[PDB]
């Protein structure tokens, strides 16, 4: 009587597991797929920004035309990718342990 | 213990939904600042036919992919009604 | 079992919130440069009143929500949490 409602409520687990897995999952491909946005995007910024150091070249560039302190991209793509790989881990440990 | 779980499952997969939703929108609202942005350069080099053959380099564009990220979200909302239902 | 579960959600919470706040920097890292580029192309059509106006367009503005997401980051870390405090009882 005892092994029939722990084997029920281990059952639920499994199953609750299975779809937390799958909630994992598709987190990771929305910011694997924002995470190219973002990366295609800073490519024509900063394609931008050499546009307008070129045509403000004698000025020392756009910044320095501005009379500005400059701005730079801080590119970390490699550190959300690690947070993704380790999503997809969690995720595969979780349904594997459900199974 | 269950079923409380579960709905608090559902609630954070709704906060993640709802961060995408706001993230995928500033990503939208910047993209169009930086079209109107190169817009801009190719007009002021059009002489040269634009910012790209003036810097004599190839040409960057955006890849939109809001839809697939949009989908996305829908799937998130989808699991979380699950959730809530049972 | 149960504290085991909500053990490894309360994880995977913390790495989504580290996820968004990383996504969130390079967003506002971003922003920074493309506003610059706007400040720099309407000092360069300054004599026409801006970039907008001398490319005759409906002029673009962001619409910065680095705040709202910092909201959303703060309720996660809230639930991831709730949910360690929560295993153990
Ligand atoms: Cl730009």
Same mark, same amino acid.
């Given at each position: 009587?005892?092994?029939?409602?722990?084997?029920?409520? +281990?059952?639920?687990?499994?199953?609750?597991?299975?779809?937390?897995?799958?909630? =994992?999952?598709?987190?990771?491909?929305?910011?694997?797929?924002?995470?190219?946005? =973002?990366?295609?995007?800073?490519?024509?910024?900063?394609?931008? #920004? #050499?546009?307008?150091?070129?045509?403000?070249?004698?000025?020392?560039?756009?910044?320095?035309?501005?009379?500005?302190?400059?701005?730079?991209?801080?590119?970390?793509?490699?550190?959300?990718?690690?947070? =993704?790989?380790?999503?997809?881990?969690?995720?595969? +440990?979780? #349904?594997? #342990?459900?199974?």
């Amino acid at each position: 009587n005892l092994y029939f409602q722990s084997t029920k409520a +281990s059952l639920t687990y499994s199953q609750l597991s299975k779809e937390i897995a799958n909630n =994992i999952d598709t987190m990771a491909k929305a910011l694997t797929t924002m995470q190219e946005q =973002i990366d295609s995007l800073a490519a024509v910024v900063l394609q931008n #920004r #050499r546009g307008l150091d070129m045509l403000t070249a004698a000025q020392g560039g756009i910044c320095l035309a501005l009379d500005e302190k400059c701005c730079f991209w801080v590119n970390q793509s490699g550190k959300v990718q690690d947070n =993704i790989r380790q999503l997809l881990n969690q995720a595969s +440990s979780l #349904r594997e #342990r459900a199974t």
